[PDB]
Amino acid sequence: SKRGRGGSSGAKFRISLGLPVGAVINCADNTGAKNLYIISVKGIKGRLNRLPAAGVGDMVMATVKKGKPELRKKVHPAVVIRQRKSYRRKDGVFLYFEDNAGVIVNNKGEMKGSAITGPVAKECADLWPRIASNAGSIA
Amino acid sequence: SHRKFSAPRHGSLGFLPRKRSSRHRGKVKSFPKDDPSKPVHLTAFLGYKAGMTHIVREVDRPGSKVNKKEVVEAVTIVETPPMVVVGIVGYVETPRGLRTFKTVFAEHISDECKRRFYKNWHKSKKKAFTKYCKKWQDDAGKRQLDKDFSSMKKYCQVIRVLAHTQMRLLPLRQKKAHLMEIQVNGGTVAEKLDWARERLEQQVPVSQVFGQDEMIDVIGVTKGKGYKGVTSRWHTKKLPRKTHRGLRKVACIGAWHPARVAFSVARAGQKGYHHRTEINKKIYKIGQGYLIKDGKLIKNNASTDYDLSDKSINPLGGFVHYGEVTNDFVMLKGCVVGTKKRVLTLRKSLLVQTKRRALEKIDLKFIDTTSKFGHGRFQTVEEKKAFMGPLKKD
RNA sequence: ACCAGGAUGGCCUAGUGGUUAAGGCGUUGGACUUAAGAUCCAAUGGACAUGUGUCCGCGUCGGUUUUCGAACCCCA
RNA sequence: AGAUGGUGAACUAUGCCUGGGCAGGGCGAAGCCAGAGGAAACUCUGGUGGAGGUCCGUAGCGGUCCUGACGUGCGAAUCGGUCGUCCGACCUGGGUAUAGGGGCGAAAGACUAAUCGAACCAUCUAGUAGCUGGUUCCCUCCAAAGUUUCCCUCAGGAUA
RNA sequence: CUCAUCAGACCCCAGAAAAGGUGUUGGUUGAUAUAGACAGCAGGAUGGUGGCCAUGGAAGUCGGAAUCCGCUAAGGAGUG
RNA sequence: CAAGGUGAACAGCCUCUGGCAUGUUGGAACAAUGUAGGUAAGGGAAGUCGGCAAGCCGGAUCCGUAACUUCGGGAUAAGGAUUGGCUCUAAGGGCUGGCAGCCGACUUAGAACU
RNA sequence: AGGUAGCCAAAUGCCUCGUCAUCUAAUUAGUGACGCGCAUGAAUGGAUGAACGAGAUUCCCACUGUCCCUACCUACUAUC
RNA sequence: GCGACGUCGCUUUUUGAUCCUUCGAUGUCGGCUCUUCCUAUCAUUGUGAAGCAGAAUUCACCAAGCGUUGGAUUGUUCACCCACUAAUAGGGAACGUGAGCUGGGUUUAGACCGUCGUGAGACAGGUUAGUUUUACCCUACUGAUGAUGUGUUGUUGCCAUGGUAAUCCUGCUCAGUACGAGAGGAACCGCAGGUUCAGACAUUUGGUGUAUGUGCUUGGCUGAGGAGCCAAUGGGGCGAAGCUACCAUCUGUGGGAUUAUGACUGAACGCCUCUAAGUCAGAAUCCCGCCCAGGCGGAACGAUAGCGCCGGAG
RNA sequence: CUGGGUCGGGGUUUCGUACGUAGCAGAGCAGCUGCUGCGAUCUAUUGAAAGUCAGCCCUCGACACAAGGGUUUGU
Ligand SMILES: [Mg+2]
Ligand SMILES: [Mg+2]
Ligand SMILES: [Mg+2]
Ligand SMILES: [Mg+2]
Ligand SMILES: [Mg+2]
Ligand SMILES: [Mg+2]
Ligand SMILES: [Mg+2]
Ligand SMILES: [Mg+2]
Ligand SMILES: [Mg+2]
Ligand SMILES: [Mg+2]
Ligand SMILES: [Mg+2]
Ligand SMILES: [Mg+2]
Ligand SMILES: [Mg+2]
Ligand SMILES: [Mg+2]
Ligand SMILES: [Mg+2]
Ligand SMILES: [Mg+2]
Ligand SMILES: [Mg+2]
Ligand SMILES: [Mg+2]
Ligand SMILES: [Mg+2]
Ligand SMILES: [Mg+2]
Ligand SMILES: [Mg+2]
Ligand SMILES: [Mg+2]
Ligand SMILES: [Mg+2]
Ligand SMILES: [Mg+2]
Ligand SMILES: [Mg+2]
Ligand SMILES: [Mg+2]
Ligand SMILES: [Mg+2]
Ligand SMILES: [Mg+2]
Ligand SMILES: [Mg+2]
Ligand SMILES: [Mg+2]
Ligand SMILES: [Mg+2]
Ligand SMILES: [Mg+2]
Ligand SMILES: [Mg+2]
Ligand SMILES: [Mg+2]
Ligand SMILES: [Mg+2]
Ligand SMILES: [Mg+2]
Ligand SMILES: [Mg+2]
Ligand SMILES: [Mg+2]
Ligand SMILES: [Mg+2]
Ligand SMILES: [Mg+2]
Ligand SMILES: [Mg+2]
Ligand SMILES: [Mg+2]
Ligand SMILES: [Mg+2]
Ligand SMILES: [Mg+2]
Ligand SMILES: [Mg+2]
Ligand SMILES: [Mg+2]
Ligand SMILES: [Mg+2]
Ligand SMILES: [Mg+2]
Ligand SMILES: [Mg+2]
């Protein structure tokens, strides 16, 4: 999934995946991009006919369908920070957002933008500490 | 020609005779291996699936991100009244297998266990063991029984004990008891036989057989779901919407040459009512029954050290489709097989447990006792009446 | 692949029955003009794609090579 | 397949004669009225008006897609939804006209009584077939050829 | 004669080659042998010479041309 | 030949007149697989040859309407707002003897409350 | 007569998934060009072009069980 | 690690060659689905060898246990590209699989263009529209009654046989350590999770919903109120139970003989030698366990109605 | 002297405050000399009403029922 040099001791629990390939999510940062079109998700080996799918915190490959013209017609890594599919935390508590949202990152994990609009899930925030630094509200 | 994209097969072939279970009570297919150095104990027990609830507990798992954090875990309640021991059966080893050598039944057998020996208790004159019971009141009869025990200690290698459930303490409509062989593990055959001879006609609680935070095995029969197709039975892909003669099928059931149908292809048939042995179910609680002390009815089964309430394990309106749990019960982690009111076999583990999830110590904080017959939102009726106040019903 | 052809001055084409190497353009030399084109007077050149056979004698006829172009390669 | 003589336009194709029928809405052609403007020519505005092989759409007429239902059917072509058109090269009854190498065709070799790249009926006719299929009791005795030559000969004959 | 952790087992005939084996069995040819061998265990490895020629220097000890003597049981102007 | 309601309507839905007995059988259960309908979290064509099928849209009032054009259209282009129930108000007529009296049909607009 | 005006990898171009641009993350598709056009071309009509089309394609917005990934309900069957 | 000039083979996942079977018919391309098999092994387990320092990559052995994906274009097989990944290996099963589907392409009849033909027409040249029938028989398969025998019946059982299952990856730690001039850069043991798969389950979340439960509402109808009904479930909001989703949750496991390989003692062959006699370690393999079924296969026990034991001839 | 079944009662739960009655609450309108009416809606009764096992739980309330019938089986 992440496969990153900067990692916490404890690994992530399985959450519900609500963002398959083809999902257009909000781009919740000031890069100028308004849309992230998911073309695949990191870490998935998959199965026959199964779409790769993403939850919060999982890194995806995404194009920009609407935004500045120097951001489009190319692929960027991105990390989903919000999702409409309700996922169960280990406290048994179910959380969802009203919007699916992500932010454009690089291979190491640094966002291209420098501020995040909207909340960021805890599952994304602890897994990506450079995202949680620019998050305003968390989970 | 080969299939292009590889795809794993649907379903296990290791549960292949996907037929309706020839037993209703789950059979221990293999008991734990006996160690003569261990104290003499029972290895299995027989309970009844009451229902499910969920718990809150803090987790001590260093290295996890849920260390010192409280989880809600699904748990299943198994109402386990004490078993009454009525028989002793011995088994000799043989190059053809394990032969039943001798069976000795107790002097007094209850009517619940007697009902197992009949297909129709009502039209019977209820005569089982009415000539066998004369052995225990005859001096030559005891002089044959003790030589049968001498023959078992001399020749038997395995000793099992016949015990039956106490149906009168259960809210089930059934009053015919379940008999079961339970293999007595422990020391020598002589002392293992003396143990069962003393516990003959006596009752065994679930406390003596099982303990808190131990992984056991749950043996049972799956919920019956009747004749089902391949899409629900073996979970194959549905055919597209344009399919002529039906889309909930399997499109190819074999090539031309093996010129038969293989046993490995998914076919429609019985789904559910399958005998299963799930392993490593953690006992999250062994709760005691409904006690009558000082005239008070003590029923604070679900009152934890973090609750200080007086509530029982029974939720509001009781368990859906079961009844009440007024006997001692086993709270197991997660889901066990079967319907509500289904008999479940609890077996001691066949494995050695050196893992942290197996040796984890469990302290329950909260037991959910909201009604499952809807979206019940109160743990106790005193809480419900305190929140609402007086109604019109006074 | 099969059939039918075609290879000649520097380029483009003639050329038999068997004896004659042809024409246009080009090249070259001299005139005209101040000079150059145009015009006038002239000159040279051909591996006749190769070897073989027929014949006195072949570019020419007849079989085999080596490069090329044209048509066909259909029913399942 | 071929020929001779007949029977069919109760289905359908087309002409003619005589009858019958086609809710409710949309757009709004020309003509017309008034107001305003202009030197005139005329031009803006607001109504009216009710045209059109005009649009949505009912009956009717048709039959696009689901390649849906059915597919030993309800039915030797039907059923459901969705659809094309629905004042005009419209739909339809009855009468009438054209007949088989002929008719009729807004033309698909379509239609011409479940039959059409030549209908149906009877006869010539037991048409011919080097080509498939079949060819009926027993015993006894003898016992092959697939080669030569010729042939519009090569799945057949004649000849040895 | 042959052991196969791929044995083999009868014309047609129903499955195998080049190449290879200190598997094992035979045979052929030539030496190196009781004028005492072959392993194995030790001991000597000599002076002319630390060689002209090259190469800074190479002295048997990078290279090419020199490859003789004697005391000898022996030692190549030296296999590493 | 062709009643009432709703409604633009001979639409559809319900009802009166008149008609009938569910379309060549009844009973019991509610398995698969069908045929005909529905709903589906998150995603929104990634399915598939192909948005096939299904779904979105829909009536009316008030706005608003592009390129193009044969100047007729395109055009219900596209895109918006409103819509219930109740209680009012205003305006739109006729007959008799710039006025009075007597009546009466449906609309349309505005407003308040809910 | 040697194909003019035009048009083009067209429903007409083998080579061919032609080359460039544009559309996409990625396009043997689409559009716009280019023209050497196997084998375009002028009433065997060429080029255009509003309106119209149950005609053939491409992209976008919206919408959805088409799919991820299936599940449940109802009617008539099947069943007895 | 290769390997010219030459030479020996294998295989039938290529095209040919041939015409033996089928022309009183064996449904002709692809894709979807689903099962199984092969190994010429891409990955993962165990290994040996490198011009293997580490990392990465090659070559080879036992090895087919388990995997080998999501898409744009094309009807495509093939191809090519984007992206993920441990890897995105190759194949067979009448070039598996049409009474399984689909019908995009071939390959009927309609029609257009180019080329060819005087013409009718032709084109492994393009283009568009074009009916996919039947199982209730036998077997096989999946489930479901039972059948012979133990006298009859019932309880508890055993297991002969048959099936069989788990998989792989990431993060923390080791460790910026070993290794390396540096650049770079591991691994064993542990710990937490995840993928694919399997078996369940519904406490919770989500879905369904004709408890036709309870409100709301349109049109109509019962004179009105109340109560209802009809509109092939009138529509809609919420909805108990029950079913149900990696769309919620739970569980997934031990040995033995060994392969490749590395070795020990040790001759052959007075040395040496992992082998000849003998012996050891040895793995996603194999076999068993676990798990699923339970034999025209046994066992123990219960109770046995005119029947069971004990002491005449036929 | 016990059992299940049916009804009733509780519990749970589902929706969301039933009919009737009252109100100087109600945009307003009408008729009378403050009253009487119409009036969608609102407020209180009233977390009311209604449903709730048919496959939810508990009653010890009421009622009847339950000691039956057929067919075979012998070592
Ligand atoms: Mg797929
Ligand atoms: Mg494969
Ligand atoms: Mg179909
Ligand atoms: Mg519940
Ligand atoms: Mg003739
Ligand atoms: Mg007529
Ligand atoms: Mg019209
Ligand atoms: Mg119209
Ligand atoms: Mg059809
Ligand atoms: Mg059918
Ligand atoms: Mg019928
Ligand atoms: Mg006509
Ligand atoms: Mg024709
Ligand atoms: Mg013949
Ligand atoms: Mg013949
Ligand atoms: Mg009916
Ligand atoms: Mg009837
Ligand atoms: Mg959805
Ligand atoms: Mg939604
Ligand atoms: Mg697609
Ligand atoms: Mg696809
Ligand atoms: Mg459609
Ligand atoms: Mg338009
Ligand atoms: Mg030209
Ligand atoms: Mg496309
Ligand atoms: Mg173009
Ligand atoms: Mg032409
Ligand atoms: Mg032409
Ligand atoms: Mg045949
Ligand atoms: Mg056939
Ligand atoms: Mg067949
Ligand atoms: Mg191999
Ligand atoms: Mg095939
Ligand atoms: Mg078949
Ligand atoms: Mg078929
Ligand atoms: Mg087609
Ligand atoms: Mg055709
Ligand atoms: Mg049947
Ligand atoms: Mg076995
Ligand atoms: Mg160092
Ligand atoms: Mg639920
Ligand atoms: Mg729900
Ligand atoms: Mg539910
Ligand atoms: Mg709902
Ligand atoms: Mg009412
Ligand atoms: Mg009706
Ligand atoms: Mg071992
Ligand atoms: Mg060895
Ligand atoms: Mg060993």
Q: Rounded CA gap, A11 and B375, in Å?
A: 34
Distance CA A110, CA A106 (A): 6
B8, exposed or middle or buried, with CB in 10 Å at 0-12, 13-18, 19+?
A: exposed
Here the tokens at position A55 are 């939850």
B67 shares contact with chain A (CB less than 8 Å):
yes
Range A20-37 burial, b when 16+ CB lie within 10 A, else e: ebebbbbbbbebbbebbb
Using a CB cutoff of 5 Å, list residues around ligand 1, an ion: A 49
Contact at CB, A90 and B6, closer than 8 angstroms:
no
* Terminal Cα-to-Cα distance of chain A (whole angstroms): 21
Strand G bases near protein CB (under 7 Å) are 23-26, 61, 65-72
Q: What share of chain B is helix, strand, coil (3-state, %, to 5)?
A: 15, 30, 55
Exp. method: cryo-EM
Alpha carbon separation from A97 to A127, B33, B183, B311 (Å, rounded): 19, 53, 55, 36
Structure tokens that stand for B198 in this block: 């003393």
Nucleotide nearest to B384 (CA to C1'): I12
Identify the residue whose tokens are 């904080």: B365
Q: Does B251 touch chain A (CB under 8 A)?
A: no
CA distance A100 to A23: 9
Those residues whose C-beta lies under 8 Å from the C-beta of residue B155, and which sit 6 or more positions away, are: B90, B92, B101
Q: Report the residue of chain B nearest A127, measured CA to CA.
A: B65
What counts of helices (H) and strands (E) characterise chain B? 6, 17
Measured to protein CB atoms, the chain D nucleotides within 7 Å are 66-69, 71
Q: How far is A122 from chain B (nearest CA, A)?
A: 12
Interface residue of A48, A89, A123 to substitute, partner B, most B CBs within 10 Å: A48
Residue B178 in tokens = 């379940």
Sort out which chain B residues have CB atoms less than 8 A from A126's CB and list them: 65
Q: Which nucleotide is nearest to A50 (CA to C1')?
A: G68
Judged on CB neighbours under 10 Å (0-12, 13-18, 19+), B137 is exposed
Angle between helices B139-155 and B189-199 in degrees, nearest 10: 140
Partners of residue B329 on adjacent β-strands:
B79, B287
Residues in chain B within 8 Å Cβ distance of A90: 66, 69, 71
Which residues, in sequence order, are CB contacts of B342 under 8 Å at separation 6+? B48, B49, B220, B221, B223
In whole angstroms, what is the distance from residue B26 CA to residue B339 CA? 13
Chain A CB contacts of B73 under 8 Å are 92
Nearest nucleic acid nucleotide to B373, CA to C1' distance: I13
Q: Which nucleotides of H are covered by protein (CB under 7 A)?
A: 31-37, 66-71, 78, 82-88, 90-97, 99-103, 132-133, 140-145, 153-160, 162-165, 170-172, 176, 191-206, 239-254, 289-294, 297, 299-304
Distance of CA B130 to the CA centre of its chain: 32
Structure's resolution in angstroms: 3.1
The end-to-end CA distance of chain B, in Å, is 79
Strand I, CB < 7 A, residues 153-192 of B: 171, 173
Q: Tell me, in Å, how far CA of B67 is from C1' of F11?
A: 70
Residue whose structure tokens are 């062994």:
B286
Protein CA B234 to sugar C1' D68 (Å): 29
Pick out the nucleotide with least CA–C1' distance to B248.
F33
User: Which residue approaches F53 most closely, CA to C1'?
Assistant: B241
**CB nearest B72 (choices: A47, A49, A92):** A92
Do B43 and B182 touch, CB atoms closer than 8 A? yes
Q: Which of B314, B303, B302, B223 has its CA nearest to residue B270? A: B223
| Per-residue b or e along B190-224, where b marks 16 or more CB atoms closer than 10 Å to that residue's CB | eebbebbbebbeeebbbeebbeebebbbbbbbbee
Half-sphere exposure of B314 toward its Cβ, with a 13 Å CA cutoff? 19
Here the tokens at position B259 are 């010129």
Nucleotide nearest to A45 (CA to C1'): H85
Q: For chain A, what percentages of helix, strand and coil (3-state, to nearest 5) are there?
A: 10, 30, 60
d(CA A8, ligand 40 centre) in Å: 29
Which of B17, B14, B21, B12 is CA-nearest to residue B235? B12
User: Residue A73 has which token pair?
Assistant: 């017609």
Give nucleotides in strand I with any atom < 7 A to a protein C-beta.
4-5, 10-15, 46-49, 55-58, 68-70
Please give the distance, rounded to the nearest whole angstrom, from the Cα atom of residue B153 to the centre of ligand 46: 84
Q: Reduced to 3 states, what is the DSSP secondary structure of residue A44?
A: coil
